[PDB]
């Protein structure tokens, strides 16, 4: 429907993965760097919604990831510090969402 939303998403889903990296070589991130990338998901995450409004069936599922990994990352904004745990449990969910989208390219 509209090809520039779509890459608009895609460049902003690129971003948030180059920082989330940046984020796991670092056992305390700045608040700028971990602000940027929250900002960078949610942003994606808008921008996914308005595409919205492949099959069905794959769209619903890389939403539902979605959902969680955002749900996930709302949590650690709680933390001054976010654990190997919970780093990598985000980083694996996150991976779906990636390879789902990627699977509608
Ligand atoms: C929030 C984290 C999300 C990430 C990291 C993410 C990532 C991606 C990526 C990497 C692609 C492939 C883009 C490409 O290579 O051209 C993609 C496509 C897509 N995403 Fe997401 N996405 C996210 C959330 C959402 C949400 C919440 C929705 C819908 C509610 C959504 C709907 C879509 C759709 C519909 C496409 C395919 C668009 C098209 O084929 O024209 N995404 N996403
Ligand atoms: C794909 C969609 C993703 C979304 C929607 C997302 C969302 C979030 C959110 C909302 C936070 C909370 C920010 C904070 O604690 O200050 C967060 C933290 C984090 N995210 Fe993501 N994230 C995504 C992908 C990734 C990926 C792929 C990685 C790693 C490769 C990653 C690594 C992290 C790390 C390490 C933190 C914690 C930073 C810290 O504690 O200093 N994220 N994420
Ligand atoms: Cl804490």
């Given at each position: 429907?509209?090809?520039?939303?779509?890459?608009?998403?895609?460049?902003?889903?690129?971003?948030?993965?180059?920082?989330?990296?940046?984020?796991?070589?670092?056992?305390?991130?700045?608040?700028?760097?971990?602000?940027?990338?929250?900002?960078?998901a949610?942003?994606?995450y808008?921008?996914?919604?308005?595409?919205?409004?492949?099959?069905?069936?794959?769209?619903?599922?890389?939403?539902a990831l979605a959902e969680q990994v955002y749900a996930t990352g709302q949590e650690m904004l709680?933390?001054?510090?976010?654990?190997?745990?919970?780093?990598?449990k985000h980083?694996?969910l996150?991976?779906?969402?990636?390879?789902?989208?990627?699977?509608?390219?």
């Amino acid at each position: 429907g509209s090809p520039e939303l779509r890459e608009k998403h895609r460049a902003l889903a690129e971003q948030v993965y180059a920082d989330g990296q940046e984020m796991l070589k670092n056992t305390s991130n700045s608040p700028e760097l971990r602000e940027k990338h929250r900002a960078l998901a949610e942003q994606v995450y808008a921008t996914g919604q308005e595409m919205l409004k492949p099959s069905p069936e794959l769209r619903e599922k890389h939403r539902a990831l979605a959902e969680q990994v955002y749900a996930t990352g709302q949590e650690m904004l709680k933390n001054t510090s976010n654990s190997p745990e919970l780093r990598e449990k985000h980083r694996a969910l996150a991976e779906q969402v990636y390879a789902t989208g990627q699977e509608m390219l």
